[PDB]
Amino acid sequence: ADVPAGVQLADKQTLVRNNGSEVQSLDPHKIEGVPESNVSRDLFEGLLISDVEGHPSPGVAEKWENKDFKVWTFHLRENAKWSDGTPVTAHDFVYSWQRLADPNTASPYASYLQYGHIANIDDIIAGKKPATDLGVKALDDHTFEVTLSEPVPYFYKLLVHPSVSPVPKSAVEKFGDKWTQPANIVTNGAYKLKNWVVNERIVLERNPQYWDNAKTVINQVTYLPISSEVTDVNRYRSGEIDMTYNNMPIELFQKLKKEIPNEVRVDPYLCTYYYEINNQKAPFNDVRVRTALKLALDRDIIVNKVKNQGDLPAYSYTPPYTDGAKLVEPEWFKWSQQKRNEEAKKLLAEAGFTAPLTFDLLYNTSDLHKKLAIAVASIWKKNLGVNVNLENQEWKTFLDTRHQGTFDVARAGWCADYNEPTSFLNTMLSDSSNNTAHYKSPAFDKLIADTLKVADDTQRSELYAKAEQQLDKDSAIVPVYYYVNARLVKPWVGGYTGKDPLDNIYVKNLYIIKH
């Protein structure tokens, strides 16, 4: 943390945060969500971290070099330590990325190393070679070398993600799946796990082995798993919580805006809200059915009349304000709603539905989502005659259901892991481990794979625009809105600028002002 000369630090340095729901796990190779990542960044540190404005900065690596953006060399700081006082070395990385890549780990983010194009990743994912063949190696105890099969100029931006954080071999091998309990867990980020009471709370305390421990200010942090947005704002307003989760209730939002405007933080967020369709299940394997759903949803109504929190109406997967994006708005988005509706009733009738398509719409337990689900079910009923049945599951189960394919249409949100369009686009590759839409298009795949062979960034951005158009002509998903990051932060929380579009908060960077 960097307390501005002049301010007064509270006597007690503690912070309570709402995390939106119970984490899937705390093992870095088993998580995929925003809540899990929030906790993960306070416990595990990889080569690079983001600074307070979102820029990639030195983490365990102190310096790194590249040869043609193809061979990356990371020089780890000599004092990096695990909470057990043992040293973090490059072997910890080698082992770690080997475990992520390995099919027996079954990480939902196994594909992250195909996103970075580490040599031999495909064959390893496919079982043709063993994980030990991955293009990574410790040159010495402090130099970690990565070999990519293609130059990836943005490779260092991917490395702030939790999946590429190191995990401690000794604990993993002893304790297996139980290595993450308070008893056995071993960490290397600014914090270490104090307690973990499921459906109750996660409490972390400063880690004395941490290399930047001298700058760390907050001593204890509690992460709450509250999935009700009304309760989060209420317990905040009662003084029990310092920073809510960043999902605001439709209900009390404009209210709060009038009573406590400077506690209402609203910033650009690189996330898209959409209805994910299971592209493999009849009748959603028909493009006419997918397109009719896409067209008949009225975004003006959802974004400007039922949510009204500043979100922008969406026509693409990748948010147009992503660095490097240059998207074309499709025709359909320029029509009026009535014209989209006419066109949607004709594609359905052509696919054999009249007076009706019936299907389930799944959401994760939440006051916000339930509200938009009912609103969308009524809009699709009214505009298209489709009957929807609503289903709700808890966070963990919801994620498992989408990976497994046992849903029709699900409410979804994807946030960038690094600010570059492949952070979105790579999740639609046929073999991606994050492809919960189950979309498979050889034309899409080839557009993305060509992006690593162009010579220039301009060429690169034109293939990103054509990939978004290929996804839109397939109507793989139903784009709803590009998010704003809205949460409530108490006046006495310092360090949180809110200017990072990825929202990569580190508790080590915050500090409680005297109050």
Curated annotation (Swiss-Prot):
<keyword id="KW-1015">Disulfide bond</keyword>
<keyword id="KW-0732">Signal</keyword>
<protein>
    <recommendedName>
        <fullName>Periplasmic oligopeptide-binding protein OppA</fullName>
    </recommendedName>
</protein>
<keyword id="KW-0571">Peptide transport</keyword>
<dbReference type="GO" id="GO:0030288">
    <property type="term" value="C:outer membrane-bounded periplasmic space"/>
</dbReference>
<dbReference type="InterPro" id="IPR030678">
    <property type="entry name" value="Peptide/Ni-bd"/>
</dbReference>
<comment type="subunit">
    <text>The complex is composed of two ATP-binding proteins (OppD and OppF), two transmembrane proteins (OppB and OppC) and a solute-binding protein (OppA).</text>
</comment>
<keyword id="KW-0574">Periplasm</keyword>
<dbReference type="GO" id="GO:1904680">
    <property type="term" value="F:peptide transmembrane transporter activity"/>
</dbReference>
<dbReference type="GO" id="GO:0015833">
    <property type="term" value="P:peptide transport"/>
</dbReference>
<comment type="function">
    <text>Part of the ABC transporter complex OppABCDF involved in the uptake of oligopeptides, including the cell wall murein tripeptide L-alanyl-gamma-D-glutamyl-meso-diaminopimelate. Plays an important nutritional role and is involved in the recycling of cell wall peptides. Binds peptides containing from two to five amino acid residues regardless of their sequence. Also binds cell wall peptides, such as L-alanyl-gamma-D-glutamyl-meso-diaminopimelate.</text>
</comment>
<dbReference type="GO" id="GO:0043190">
    <property type="term" value="C:ATP-binding cassette (ABC) transporter complex"/>
</dbReference>
<dbReference type="GO" id="GO:0015031">
    <property type="term" value="P:protein transport"/>
</dbReference>
<dbReference type="InterPro" id="IPR000914">
    <property type="entry name" value="SBP_5_dom"/>
</dbReference>
<feature type="disulfide bond">
    <location>
        <begin position="271"/>
        <end position="415"/>
    </location>
</feature>
<keyword id="KW-0813">Transport</keyword>
<dbReference type="InterPro" id="IPR023765">
    <property type="entry name" value="SBP_5_CS"/>
</dbReference>
<keyword id="KW-0653">Protein transport</keyword>
<comment type="similarity">
    <text>Belongs to the bacterial solute-binding protein 5 family.</text>
</comment>
<dbReference type="InterPro" id="IPR039424">
    <property type="entry name" value="SBP_5"/>
</dbReference>
<dbReference type="Pfam" id="PF00496">
    <property type="entry name" value="SBP_bac_5"/>
</dbReference>
